[PDB]
A paper describes a structure:
HRSV belongs to the Mononegavirales order with the non-segmented negative-strand RNA genome fully coated by the viral nucleoprotein N. The resulting helical nucleocapsid (NC) shields the viral genetic material from recognition by the innate immune system while serving as template for replication and transcription by the viral RNA polymerase complex, thereby constituting a potential drug target. The helical HRSV nucleocapsid is a template for the viral RNA synthesis and a scaffold for the virion assembly. The helical NC, together with the RNA polymerase L, its phosphoprotein cofactor P and the transcription factor M2-1, form the HRSV RNA synthesis complex that constitues the minimal infectious unit of the virus. We explore the polymorphism of the nucleocapsid-like assemblies, report five structures of the full-length particles and two alternative arrangements formed by a C-terminally truncated nucleoprotein mutant, and demonstrate the functional importance of the identified longitudinal interfaces.
Numbering used by the authors:
A (entry chain C), B (entry chain B), C (entry chain A), D (entry chain D), E (entry chain E): 2 to 379
Write the structure that this text describes.
RNA sequence: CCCCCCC
RNA sequence: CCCCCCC
RNA sequence: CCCCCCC
RNA sequence: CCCCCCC
RNA sequence: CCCCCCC
């Protein structure tokens, strides 16, 4: 009768997108440099060498960080990643070489890695300014500690920690989260800031921004690396920091869904409004779709996965405005530059939410007591 | 046995129509160029010179955009798409040559793309006008940033984004959606309109009208390119914009089905009328057919698919009238030049719907709160 | 006992007709010209010169439209269709030559098509008339647009759209649908009558009437061409008009089945009559036979298929009369020249249907309205 | 126990008749002309000559019609049909020759058909009569249309339409259906009798009576021609008329079976009498036998099929009397001369049937009037 | 487990009578005349000469009719039939010779038959009496039509139609059915008695009793002849009369089984008695044996087949008693002289049967009927 | 015979 | 014929 | 279009 | 004996 | 012992 009149739209859009039998493959360019497990030691060394040298031009650092992440991923692993992401890449293998260069009269040996995008001379320079920083440190503080040196196995993870902050703030995608990444990199990694003096949140964040914006496939590489890291059994304290930071990106850009479930929990009065009970059916449909997506349903906005718009509650202006007003009333909404599309419900829900947090009676159903001892205390 | 006197008309039309044992093949003309994955880079560059050029003559941009879509699909992929759409073409290979022409006394060498429907001289004119605009740009502000030049990896998707707007607004089919395309293309892509001084929504939209009118195979190529494009697990911000614009087209020409679902949701009164319960059987059949189609049933009016008419609610004058009246009452029509077929139901349902949008009681049964203090609240 | 006195008569007749082991073959005449896919371009071009020509002699247009239909089907496809329909035709291949006629002193070269039922001088005269009309248009409006010319890929399908109208109205079998064809071809195809100045629906409809009456195999070629066309995935909007106009034919000459379903829907009282419950059993037999036939059961009257008379409800005077009376009551039948065979039931059912139409109380059982609160709001 | 005390008798007589190992073949006569598919055009033309001729000598038209039937079947198919029917006839091949006959002083060249049963001089007489009639029409009304003339592809099918009427009314087999053939051929074929001025239904009907009484094998040739004709997918309107008129014969001589099904459906009371329940088992075995036969169980009485009498309900005098009394009660038997064998049951069934026709209360349960509001209003 | 105890007795008597190893054979006597196909014409003319004659001496008409029967079957076929019936006869062939006997001074040419039991002079007397009768008839009315004379190809079949009546009524075997033969031969064959004034069914039927008792093998010749005739698909009206009149003889002598089925149909009560439920097993074995025989289960009593007596229900006095009592209750037992064996069951079943024929049963459940006022108001 | 309207 | 809106 | 906060 | 009407 | 009527 009137129960079969339903056009299941988001499920059908999902079925359309998943079941397209023609596959596109996007041209990256010439090739991507793909180290294996053996180059991981050298890449960690390079990251530490970046972090020990004072105020280096860290403009390349995002590239080295992506190299480290994909090197721990592995040759066949990153090739599988770029096959799954739909890209034509030829595996430009990475090997360890040694180049002797005569600088300032003295010719000495420095190890060199085979990179298409990164040249030998840049490595040799960053090496010489690293030596400069090392000698100045030996002059000032006498001796360098094993923790104060670039030999720690957590330098790459520190760089990718700042990258994880960047990728969390890349949900907006308009270079607005740079200040918040600065705040987070100042707050988190305090001890790394005090031990490694070469940590510059501004330069590292800007380099990661640029390498992510110019090279979209690197974002996918890093996202699956981050899911891989956040599944290992154990790790160092810095790897724990990175896992905790990257798990913040889960649910990036989907905050309307979380505020909706919160408005369900805090029981905003006007989720029973008529115009909201109108769209509650499609809201339930969206939430069930999010659950069915499950594990990755939080990384569809970090990646610009085109099934992300399937998880948007902005297409329901009544529900969107009531939930946004509810979140605003409880004060959770900060400078969230998201306008409501229904002013009346937004203002009314904001008023009730402002009212609610001030009041609040002791819920005796929650309390386990049978005899009111507080009344006895009274 | 009056329960068995039933005729299933849409299902039988579908079974007639998809189970034909004789097939036609409509010859296009001479041939269609089907570039392989190699020329994708040069096509991106061509779009880059298209957008960099000040006030460019974009009247040859629709062909280049469709060429980019064929490239990203791939040679065997686009040939498969045409052969499946019932079309004689021959696989016209695409390769890059160099043409040396002495122009204005000086001899310059250019990298030319060899195409049947696109000639060398107009490509050279594009390139030289790009050079002139590049010289002007460098003169006015000194240095061109990498973002400010033709080397961007997303000019093709920018042109295809204006194309997606055109494809969405071709449901009118009579060049009446140009104004809406202009508005949307100015609202969307503020950054790109601000950066590339040659982005004209009017010129590109008119070009895309022309290319989609003259060559009806291009529209199926583009729609299947859009469905395949919106499936890839990754993307940039501009491919994300393209997927977002495209998924607007899903359900083009079929707003009446979704407005019928809306009438079900808001529990409109005149869906219980007797002359509407007369049609509810076939309306349920149409909606069941739409669900059974599932995926592509949103792209049957963009593609001028002959199976589209089976998803029309104009054959139900009473149900169409009440649903359009409901849409009018809630004010969510706008214009929708389509007229109702039963003026009495339209006016009465519209009056009730306008009664809905101003009333609205906060249904407290929706909130599953056990607290009885709500009575004190109210 | 009296459960097995059931003479399955419609099913038995269908079994007798389908399971006959002797086949007839009917001779058509001299031959039928069956162009292959190659000549489609020039046949479309001929239709274009037909439509551009001012007030052209359209008495030779039906043959050209049918030739375009076989060209779109192809050589072996139309030969297979004629073989399956039981006709003796030999494949008169069609190819492109040049025949030069000296007219007005000058000797000109005209591209000519070699056919048996089409001469050469007819194509020459069509060409010269089109040239005169083209010159006249150039003189009047200065310049001719490509949409004002014969080269467009829509002229053939415009002619075939008028053919589809005529094929729908050919059910009456009396040349009575010429008025309806004119009205429909003026409502539909407004743009093309505004652009092409030679579209005369009267002359084209008359020529199509003539070509279908004097060559009966062209009707089967055309019906299976339409079924083949409306299966294609995509097309232009003129092929969209053709598909939409053609699928109006499905259910030509079987309106009584549809009105029987409708009279079941509106719950007309006299479907419970004793004299109608007598016939309900074999009526249900007809309906389940129609469903068993399924797809093509709508094109048995357009084709004069002998199995058409098995889908007639006029062999049930009580049920046919009550259904026609119900249809009259609701105003559906406008000028349906079909007398009811039981005047009492016809008039009584019409009276009850008229009681239905103006009355009708809004059922609140269909709507899941928990509280009928609007009653107090009234 | 006694669920297996049943002596199935109709099936036993069936196998007795069919499975007698003596198939004795009779001597027929000289031969039958069995033209192949190439004589079709000339026989069609000859039928046209007969039809356009003023008050034509139609006493040789029946042979022309049946010869057209064989020509449409084909030489080998008609030979196979005569072999299956069990006749000694040899394939007298038919070809076209030219006989130049000097008539009225002038010698003219004519197309003559070599037939043993149709000599040259009478064909020439018919042709000269056609010439006279054509000159008379041209002199009277100026110019005859090509539809008015002999070459139209359905003159033979007009002749065979009148043959089909005669075969329907040849159940009695004593030329007592000539009045019905005249009335039907006046009602049907109004346009054709308006145009072809030689159509005298009395004359053609009498000739077909004569040819089917002189040549019995023509009855089987024609019946299988009709069954083969009614199998074609499509055809002209005249072939549709012929097939629809042939379908009237299916069930010739077996009106009692269909009247019995009707008497079951109309729920006549006396089907529950004792003297009817005595024979309801044999009646249900006859109906089961008819259903088992299926397709050809309708064309047994037209043919002289030996198993004809097994499908008669007149051997059951009580059920026969009830069925025939019901049929006479409802008035559906106009002048059926068959008398009941049991008068009392006949009169009682007739009286109850007449009581049915005037009374009759609307069933409100079979009609799906679940809604008590609609139930109470009516 | 006690379904194991079934001693099947009728089937065992079957295989005992069939698989006997001592088969003692019988010599008929001298021989019998067995004409071939050629003597058919003269025997047919001779039967015509018998019929045309007024009050003709029919003492030899039975032998002449049987000679016509053998002549139509043939020579090898009648020999085969006599052999399979187990007879020792030699084929005394009969040929057409000419005998000139001078009568009353005039010598007349007559072509005559050499027959063992039919002399030359007797058939000469028949010829001359036919001539005298023709003389008288021509003098009295003047002119006689071709259907009124001896050359009719159906005079022999009129004789054999009376023979078919004889064969049906030959079950009693003691010339008791002569009045039924006369009545059936006056109802049937009224036209012939109007035409051929020699038809005395009393005389012909006495002749046929004489020829069937005097030559007991003529009964098998004739029965197989009739089964052969009723299988030829073509024949005139007299041959149709013979077929329909012969298949009356099927089931001769076995009315008891048919009336048992009939009593099962009325649902007579005394088939649930104890002393009938005892013998239901033997009754069902008899009925299954009858079904297993099938075809020839009907002509075992006309022929003197030794396996005849195994199909008698008189051996079950209680089931035979109830069946005969019932079929006397429903009236359909005429002068059947067979008294029942168990008078109590006979009378009780007859009383119940006569009680039934006053009241009507209800059979509504097969179709939808509310049946509250529909019942008892009928 | 069937068909018939509107779209 | 179908389509038509905003996004 | 979607996205925008805090950790 | 079978067939028989109207379409 | 089997058969037995009507069509």
């Amino acid at each position: 009768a009137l129960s079969k009149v339903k056009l299941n739209d988001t499920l059908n859009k999902d079925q359309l997108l998943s079941s397209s039998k023609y596959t596109i493959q996007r041209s990256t360019g010439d090739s991507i440099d793909t180290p294996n497990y053996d180059v991981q030691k050298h890449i960690n060394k390079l990251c530490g060498m970046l972090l020990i040298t004072e105020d280096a031009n860290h403009k390349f650092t995002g590239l080295i960080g992506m190299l480290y992440a994909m090197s721990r991923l592995g040759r066949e692993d990153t090739i599988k990643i770029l096959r799954d992401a739909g890209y034509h890449v030829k595996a430009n293998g990475v090997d360890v070489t040694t180049h002797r260069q005569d600088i300032n009269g003295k010719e000495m040996k420095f190890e060199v890695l085979t990179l298409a995008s990164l040249t030998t001379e840049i490595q040799i320079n960053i090496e010489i300014e690293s030596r400069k920083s090392y000698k100045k440190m030996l002059k000032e503080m006498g001796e360098v500690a094993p923790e104060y040196r670039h030999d720690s196995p957590d330098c790459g993870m520190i760089i990718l920690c700042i990258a994880a902050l960047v990728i969390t703030k890349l949900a907006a995608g308009d270079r607005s989260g740079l200040t918040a990444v600065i705040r987070r990199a100042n707050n988190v990694l305090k001890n790394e800031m005090k031990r490694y003096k070469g940590l510059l949140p501004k330069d590292i964040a800007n380099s990661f921004y640029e390498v992510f914006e110019k090279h979209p496939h690197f974002i996918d590489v890093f996202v699956h690396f981050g899911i891989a890291q956040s599944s290992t059994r154990g790790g160092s304290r810095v790897e724990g920091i990175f896992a905790g930071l990257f798990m913040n990106a889960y649910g990036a850009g989907q905050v309307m869904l979380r505020w909706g479930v919160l408005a369900k929990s805090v029981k905003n009065i006007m989720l029973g409004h008529a115009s909201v009970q109108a769209e509650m059916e499609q809201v339930v449909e969206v939430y069930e779709y999010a659950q069915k997506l499950g594990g990755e349903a939080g990384f569809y906005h970090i990646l610009n996965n085109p099934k992300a718009s399937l998880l948007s509650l902005t297409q329901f202006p009544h529900f969107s405005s009531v939930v946004l007003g509810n979140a605003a009333g409880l004060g959770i909404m900060g400078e969230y530059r998201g306008t409501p599309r229904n002013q009346d419900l937004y203002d009314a829900a904001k008023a009730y939410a402002e009212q609610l947090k001030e009041n609040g009676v002791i819920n005796y159903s929650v309390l386990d007591l049978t005899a009111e001892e507080l009344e006895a205390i009274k």
